Design a protein around this ligand. Structure first.
Ligand SMILES: Nc1nc2c(ncn2[C@@H]2O[C@H](COP(=O)(O)OP(=O)(O)OP(=O)(O)O)[C@@H](O)[C@H]2O)c(=O)[nH]1
Ligand SMILES: [Mg+2]
Lengths: 135, 171
């Protein structure tokens, strides 16, 4: 299935197979939702963007965003991809998500914003400035 | 110092037997399936520090599996398969993946896994040592142990690395 393929390759950071999958979806050769959520125990409720942000696959995140992946999708915990990238201290992915106008004020199911879940000071301070402005 | 260790794997691979061999030096040929998830606690020596391991034993049968909320806080995840049942090795990727997204460690690439290939005392082995080692090494060098819960082979050695890596992770 094209969506199961998308979730598999995004989680594992196989950038070329992701790119091939998206350029093929762009031409309607396959039925595939770029914002699909997983149904396996291995990805339940997660988008390909979620998976690639949590596991730190920068190139997959770029290709997904450039191809129009919704930046503000939520998983069953109420986390956005920004939350996942902030949580794991991925500065360069946090920047890339801000470049695509990620909402920094979204509060997850446990009452925390992306700024509030990071341990990287450079990420916390940077999300403080944007959230100051966005709010 | 409380260390939280989760034991995952398909039904019948020997999770409960490895835990009972380690904790009570006992083994039973009779099979009694685990329901849900529960733990015991065991004092263990890591180098020269005495620590407490909270060891969670889990249901391999889907009908007895409950939620995975208890994954949170784990300091180490043990993946068990049966070397005579090759599909129990094939499920290891999804066991590990579900642990990572549900437990959500901050550093998923370095979170400590340990893989036990159990039942090396049986005839009709199907999973090659080299195959299991190559998969473990490809996941950022997961330590791999071959064990027999029945004959008590490498059980103590495995849980010594489990405790050492959980202690490092907890600290
Ligand atoms: N020969 C041999 N038998 C084993 C070994 N380990 C477990 N067994 C047997 O395999 C069967 C399953 O062992 P269990 O420990 O109950 O397996 P489990 O992973 O806890 O199974 P579930 O609770 O259903 O998830 C039992 O009959 C055990 O006696 C082993 O190392 N060698
Ligand atoms: Mg059991």
């Amino acid at each position: 299935s094209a969506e199961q393929q998308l979730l598999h390759h995004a989680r594992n950071g196989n950038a070329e197979e992701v790119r091939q999958l998206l350029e093929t979806m762009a031409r309607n050769e396959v039925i595939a939702d770029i914002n699909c959520k997983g149904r396996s125990k291995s990805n339940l409720g997660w988008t390909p963007l979620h998976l690639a942000c949590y596991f730190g696959h920068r190139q997959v995140v770029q290709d997904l965003l450039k191809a129009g992946a919704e930046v503000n999708v939520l998983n069953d915990m109420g986390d956005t991809p920004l939350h996942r990238a902030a949580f794991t201290g991925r500065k360069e992915l946090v920047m890339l998500l801000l470049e695509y106008n990620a909402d920094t004020t979204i509060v997850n199911g446990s009452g925390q914003t992306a700024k509030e879940v990071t341990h990287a000071e450079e990420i916390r301070s940077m999300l403080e400035a944007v959230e100051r402005t966005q709010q | 110092v409380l260390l939280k260790v989760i034991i995952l794997g398909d039904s019948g691979v020997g999770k409960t037997s490895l835990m009972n061999q380690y904790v009570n030096k006992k083994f039973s040929n009779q099979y009694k399936a685990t329901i849900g998830a529960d733990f015991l606690t065991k004092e263990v020596m890591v180098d020269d520090r005495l620590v407490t391991m909270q060891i969670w034993d889990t249901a391999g049968l889907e009908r007895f599996q409950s939620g995975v909320a208890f994954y949170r806080g784990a300091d180490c995840c043990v993946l068990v398969f049966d070397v005579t049942a090759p599909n129990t090795f094939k499920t290891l990727d999804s066991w590990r993946d579900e642990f990572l997204i549900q437990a959500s460690p901050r550093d998923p690439e370095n979170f400590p896994f340990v893989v036990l290939g159990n039942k090396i005392d049986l005839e009709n082995r199907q999973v090659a040592t080299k195959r299991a080692q190559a998969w473990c090494y490809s996941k950022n060098n997961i330590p791999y142990f071959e064990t027999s819960a029945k004959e008590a082979i490498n059980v103590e050695q495995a849980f010594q690395t489990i405790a050492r890596n959980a202690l490092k992770q907890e600290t």
